mmCIF file of C-alpha atoms in Angstrom:
data_model
loop_
_atom_site.group_PDB
_atom_site.id
_atom_site.type_symbol
_atom_site.label_atom_id
_atom_site.label_comp_id
_atom_site.label_asym_id
_atom_site.label_seq_id
_atom_site.Cartn_x
_atom_site.Cartn_y
_atom_site.Cartn_z
ATOM 1 C CA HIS A 8 134.891 -6.236 147.624
ATOM 2 C CA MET A 9 135.442 -4.505 150.988
ATOM 3 C CA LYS A 10 137.629 -1.552 152.025
ATOM 4 C CA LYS A 11 139.307 -0.913 155.359
ATOM 5 C CA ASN A 12 141.966 1.362 156.852
ATOM 6 C CA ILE A 13 144.642 -0.358 158.939
ATOM 7 C CA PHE A 14 147.965 0.509 160.589
ATOM 8 C CA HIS A 15 147.285 4.116 161.564
ATOM 9 C CA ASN A 16 150.311 6.381 162.064
ATOM 10 C CA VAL A 17 153.024 3.795 161.415
ATOM 11 C CA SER A 18 156.535 3.946 159.939
ATOM 12 C CA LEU A 19 157.549 1.478 157.217
ATOM 13 C CA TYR A 20 161.219 0.501 157.470
ATOM 14 C CA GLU A 21 161.599 -2.547 155.225
ATOM 15 C CA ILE A 22 160.041 -4.614 152.449
ATOM 16 C CA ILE A 23 161.285 -8.201 152.424
ATOM 17 C CA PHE A 24 160.797 -11.135 150.057
ATOM 18 C CA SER A 25 160.357 -14.582 151.669
ATOM 19 C CA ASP A 26 159.107 -18.073 150.811
ATOM 20 C CA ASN A 27 161.249 -18.239 147.662
ATOM 21 C CA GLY A 28 159.883 -14.900 146.469
ATOM 22 C CA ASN A 29 156.189 -15.804 146.922
ATOM 23 C CA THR A 30 155.666 -13.577 149.981
ATOM 24 C CA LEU A 31 156.316 -9.917 150.740
ATOM 25 C CA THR A 32 156.463 -8.694 154.331
ATOM 26 C CA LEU A 33 156.321 -5.014 155.229
ATOM 27 C CA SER A 34 157.595 -4.135 158.710
ATOM 28 C CA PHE A 35 156.680 -1.095 160.773
ATOM 29 C CA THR A 36 157.584 0.879 163.881
ATOM 30 C CA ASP A 37 155.287 3.155 165.848
ATOM 31 C CA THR A 38 155.655 6.918 165.522
ATOM 32 C CA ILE A 39 155.825 7.709 169.264
ATOM 33 C CA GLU A 40 158.586 5.773 171.037
ATOM 34 C CA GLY A 41 159.745 4.405 167.677
ATOM 35 C CA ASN A 42 159.663 0.775 168.780
ATOM 36 C CA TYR A 43 158.811 -2.181 166.597
ATOM 37 C CA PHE A 44 155.073 -2.379 165.987
ATOM 38 C CA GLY A 45 154.227 -5.125 163.521
ATOM 39 C CA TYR A 46 153.988 -6.317 159.971
ATOM 40 C CA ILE A 47 151.771 -6.879 156.945
ATOM 41 C CA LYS A 48 152.360 -10.213 155.219
ATOM 42 C CA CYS A 49 151.309 -10.502 151.557
ATOM 43 C CA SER A 50 151.281 -14.206 150.622
ATOM 44 C CA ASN A 51 151.354 -15.441 146.999
ATOM 45 C CA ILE A 52 152.137 -12.143 145.320
ATOM 46 C CA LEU A 53 150.152 -11.109 142.270
ATOM 47 C CA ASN A 54 151.749 -7.735 141.717
ATOM 48 C CA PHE A 55 153.915 -5.213 143.544
ATOM 49 C CA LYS A 56 154.284 -1.575 142.475
ATOM 50 C CA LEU A 57 156.474 1.130 143.988
ATOM 51 C CA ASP A 58 156.373 4.559 142.361
ATOM 52 C CA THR A 59 158.318 7.370 143.999
ATOM 53 C CA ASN A 60 156.266 9.925 142.029
ATOM 54 C CA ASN A 61 159.053 12.543 141.981
ATOM 55 C CA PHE A 62 158.534 12.819 145.748
ATOM 56 C CA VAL A 63 161.995 11.858 147.027
ATOM 57 C CA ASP A 64 164.578 14.578 146.413
ATOM 58 C CA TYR A 65 167.636 12.548 145.464
ATOM 59 C CA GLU A 66 169.747 15.709 145.346
ATOM 60 C CA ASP A 67 168.951 15.854 149.095
ATOM 61 C CA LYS A 68 171.425 13.722 151.041
ATOM 62 C CA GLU A 69 169.077 13.355 154.019
ATOM 63 C CA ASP A 70 166.082 12.180 151.960
ATOM 64 C CA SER A 71 165.270 8.513 151.493
ATOM 65 C CA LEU A 72 162.399 6.084 151.094
ATOM 66 C CA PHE A 73 162.791 4.453 154.546
ATOM 67 C CA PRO A 74 161.648 5.199 157.170
ATOM 68 C CA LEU A 75 158.353 5.965 155.422
ATOM 69 C CA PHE A 76 155.761 7.565 157.685
ATOM 70 C CA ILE A 77 152.231 6.439 156.780
ATOM 71 C CA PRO A 78 148.964 7.916 158.128
ATOM 72 C CA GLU A 79 147.045 4.724 157.244
ATOM 73 C CA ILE A 80 147.036 1.788 154.818
ATOM 74 C CA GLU A 81 144.032 0.972 152.620
ATOM 75 C CA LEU A 82 143.117 -2.727 152.571
ATOM 76 C CA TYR A 83 140.766 -4.101 149.896
ATOM 77 C CA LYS A 84 139.415 -7.657 149.984
ATOM 78 C CA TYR A 85 138.162 -9.266 146.768
ATOM 79 C CA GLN A 86 136.724 -12.730 146.206
ATOM 80 C CA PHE A 87 140.080 -14.419 145.584
ATOM 81 C CA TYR A 88 142.769 -11.931 146.664
ATOM 82 C CA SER A 89 143.451 -8.731 148.592
ATOM 83 C CA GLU A 90 145.301 -5.475 147.936
ATOM 84 C CA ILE A 91 146.982 -2.870 150.132
ATOM 85 C CA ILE A 92 147.532 0.680 148.908
ATOM 86 C CA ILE A 93 149.967 3.110 150.529
ATOM 87 C CA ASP A 94 149.651 6.654 149.171
ATOM 88 C CA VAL A 95 152.030 9.169 150.793
ATOM 89 C CA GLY A 96 153.355 10.946 147.736
ATOM 90 C CA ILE A 97 155.274 7.768 147.163
ATOM 91 C CA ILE A 98 152.777 5.060 146.163
ATOM 92 C CA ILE A 99 153.026 1.351 147.001
ATOM 93 C CA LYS A 100 150.421 -1.166 145.804
ATOM 94 C CA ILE A 101 150.562 -4.891 146.556
ATOM 95 C CA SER A 102 148.050 -7.534 145.484
ATOM 96 C CA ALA A 103 148.363 -11.037 146.942
ATOM 97 C CA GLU A 104 146.182 -14.097 147.452
ATOM 98 C CA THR A 105 146.119 -13.488 151.222
ATOM 99 C CA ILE A 106 147.087 -10.456 153.275
ATOM 100 C CA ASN A 107 147.395 -10.800 157.055
ATOM 101 C CA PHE A 108 148.913 -8.614 159.724
ATOM 102 C CA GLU A 109 149.956 -8.344 163.383
ATOM 103 C CA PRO A 110 148.992 -6.859 165.703
ATOM 104 C CA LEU A 111 145.253 -6.926 165.001
ATOM 105 C CA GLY A 112 144.827 -3.457 166.539
ATOM 106 C CA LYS A 113 146.586 -0.787 168.562
ATOM 107 C CA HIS B 8 168.164 5.970 124.388
ATOM 108 C CA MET B 9 170.468 2.984 124.013
ATOM 109 C CA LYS B 10 169.066 -0.539 124.440
ATOM 110 C CA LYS B 11 171.240 -3.519 125.331
ATOM 111 C CA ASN B 12 170.806 -7.178 126.327
ATOM 112 C CA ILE B 13 172.790 -8.185 129.430
ATOM 113 C CA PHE B 14 173.016 -11.075 131.905
ATOM 114 C CA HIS B 15 172.396 -13.967 129.542
ATOM 115 C CA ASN B 16 171.108 -17.231 131.064
ATOM 116 C CA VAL B 17 171.130 -16.111 134.686
ATOM 117 C CA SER B 18 169.024 -17.046 137.707
ATOM 118 C CA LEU B 19 167.623 -14.283 139.936
ATOM 119 C CA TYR B 20 167.540 -15.365 143.581
ATOM 120 C CA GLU B 21 166.953 -12.140 145.576
ATOM 121 C CA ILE B 22 165.746 -8.547 145.290
ATOM 122 C CA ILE B 23 166.988 -6.449 148.212
ATOM 123 C CA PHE B 24 166.258 -2.875 149.291
ATOM 124 C CA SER B 25 169.053 -0.988 150.994
ATOM 125 C CA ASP B 26 168.591 0.201 154.566
ATOM 126 C CA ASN B 27 167.332 3.609 153.474
ATOM 127 C CA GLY B 28 165.398 2.114 150.546
ATOM 128 C CA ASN B 29 167.045 4.284 147.884
ATOM 129 C CA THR B 30 168.829 1.322 146.253
ATOM 130 C CA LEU B 31 167.593 -2.020 144.942
ATOM 131 C CA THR B 32 170.056 -4.873 144.370
ATOM 132 C CA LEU B 33 169.172 -7.895 142.235
ATOM 133 C CA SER B 34 171.492 -10.866 142.800
ATOM 134 C CA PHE B 35 172.077 -13.700 140.338
ATOM 135 C CA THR B 36 173.665 -17.115 139.995
ATOM 136 C CA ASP B 37 174.546 -18.806 136.784
ATOM 137 C CA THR B 38 172.158 -21.490 135.652
ATOM 138 C CA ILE B 39 174.910 -24.114 135.421
ATOM 139 C CA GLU B 40 175.542 -25.202 139.040
ATOM 140 C CA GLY B 41 174.260 -22.168 140.947
ATOM 141 C CA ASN B 42 177.531 -20.348 141.566
ATOM 142 C CA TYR B 43 177.276 -16.622 142.222
ATOM 143 C CA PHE B 44 177.265 -14.642 138.972
ATOM 144 C CA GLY B 45 176.840 -10.968 139.839
ATOM 145 C CA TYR B 46 174.355 -8.202 140.549
ATOM 146 C CA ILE B 47 172.401 -5.284 139.133
ATOM 147 C CA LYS B 48 172.257 -2.283 141.476
ATOM 148 C CA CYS B 49 169.547 0.321 140.850
ATOM 149 C CA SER B 50 170.276 3.595 142.662
ATOM 150 C CA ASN B 51 167.694 6.306 143.349
ATOM 151 C CA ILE B 52 164.616 4.314 142.407
ATOM 152 C CA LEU B 53 161.923 5.905 140.270
ATOM 153 C CA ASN B 54 159.593 2.938 139.919
ATOM 154 C CA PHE B 55 159.598 -0.807 140.515
ATOM 155 C CA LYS B 56 156.959 -3.178 139.197
ATOM 156 C CA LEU B 57 156.685 -6.932 139.670
ATOM 157 C CA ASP B 58 153.752 -8.736 138.051
ATOM 158 C CA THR B 59 153.691 -12.514 138.222
ATOM 159 C CA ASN B 60 150.987 -12.542 135.510
ATOM 160 C CA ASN B 61 149.637 -15.969 136.602
ATOM 161 C CA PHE B 62 152.979 -17.592 135.713
ATOM 162 C CA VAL B 63 153.613 -18.771 139.291
ATOM 163 C CA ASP B 64 151.167 -21.609 140.024
ATOM 164 C CA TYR B 65 150.204 -21.072 143.665
ATOM 165 C CA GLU B 66 148.142 -24.282 143.619
ATOM 166 C CA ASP B 67 151.439 -26.086 142.907
ATOM 167 C CA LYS B 68 153.112 -26.061 146.317
ATOM 168 C CA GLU B 69 156.484 -26.443 144.565
ATOM 169 C CA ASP B 70 156.245 -23.369 142.306
ATOM 170 C CA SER B 71 157.867 -20.092 143.352
ATOM 171 C CA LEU B 72 159.157 -16.822 141.931
ATOM 172 C CA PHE B 73 162.789 -17.498 142.917
ATOM 173 C CA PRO B 74 164.964 -18.774 141.485
ATOM 174 C CA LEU B 75 163.796 -16.938 138.374
ATOM 175 C CA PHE B 76 165.504 -18.184 135.236
ATOM 176 C CA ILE B 77 166.211 -15.385 132.752
ATOM 177 C CA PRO B 78 167.456 -15.774 129.162
ATOM 178 C CA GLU B 79 168.516 -12.109 129.091
ATOM 179 C CA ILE B 80 167.753 -8.731 130.657
ATOM 180 C CA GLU B 81 166.955 -5.629 128.609
ATOM 181 C CA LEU B 82 168.859 -2.526 129.733
ATOM 182 C CA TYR B 83 167.741 0.894 128.490
ATOM 183 C CA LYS B 84 169.951 3.910 129.150
ATOM 184 C CA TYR B 85 168.017 7.142 128.674
ATOM 185 C CA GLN B 86 169.538 10.595 129.004
ATOM 186 C CA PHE B 87 168.541 11.061 132.649
ATOM 187 C CA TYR B 88 167.752 7.544 133.963
ATOM 188 C CA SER B 89 167.999 3.847 133.128
ATOM 189 C CA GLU B 90 165.560 0.937 133.140
ATOM 190 C CA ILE B 91 165.847 -2.832 133.213
ATOM 191 C CA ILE B 92 163.096 -5.142 132.002
ATOM 192 C CA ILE B 93 162.909 -8.856 132.817
ATOM 193 C CA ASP B 94 160.125 -10.453 130.764
ATOM 194 C CA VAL B 95 159.780 -14.201 131.347
ATOM 195 C CA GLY B 96 155.985 -14.207 131.603
ATOM 196 C CA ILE B 97 156.608 -12.833 135.041
ATOM 197 C CA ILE B 98 157.589 -9.203 134.402
ATOM 198 C CA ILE B 99 159.953 -7.064 136.491
ATOM 199 C CA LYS B 100 160.617 -3.461 135.463
ATOM 200 C CA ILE B 101 162.842 -1.073 137.408
ATOM 201 C CA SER B 102 163.627 2.536 136.515
ATOM 202 C CA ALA B 103 166.340 4.322 138.489
ATOM 203 C CA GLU B 104 168.577 7.338 138.092
ATOM 204 C CA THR B 105 171.581 5.008 137.802
ATOM 205 C CA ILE B 106 171.861 1.287 137.102
ATOM 206 C CA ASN B 107 175.227 -0.439 137.442
ATOM 207 C CA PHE B 108 176.126 -4.088 137.206
ATOM 208 C CA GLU B 109 178.939 -6.621 137.603
ATOM 209 C CA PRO B 110 180.336 -8.468 135.780
ATOM 210 C CA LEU B 111 180.854 -6.253 132.730
#
């Protein structure tokens, strides 16, 4: 069990299944120029939770999940799997056998 | 509250967020020869949960979530939102303000 903050001040713009559903990849831009920044790859998914937590105003036309601006992403490493937690009103939790990401730092 | 079983004997092959992320589309084939069957579109998502519950053997290099064979899907229509539940060991639950599907 370890904890670590990664991907400071990023913008999540997609969540994509791959490898016949076994992998989830989250892709991000930076919050300055807005260019592509990188990704978090969650391989061999254990669980995935998205809860909008009454945060998105669906009566608001201009309001939507993506792009989702994120101050930082919590990464937990256990003996046999890892978990990322995104908590920005909306909450996203993903547990997977391996979690890797690029780039390794800003 | 009205509960209903839909999409009998289907195979789920993708779960896709829209560009703005407000909509989730689940796409299905039949389980006969893999021809396209239809979709369930969940608009204005409230929550989405996928738990593989140790039913995908990751030590078996051949095992994978998709295609996910489904005997039926439970559809709940509450007063102000709807929910689908897929329970095949693997569990998928999606609540959204509206849930629409084709074919009817």
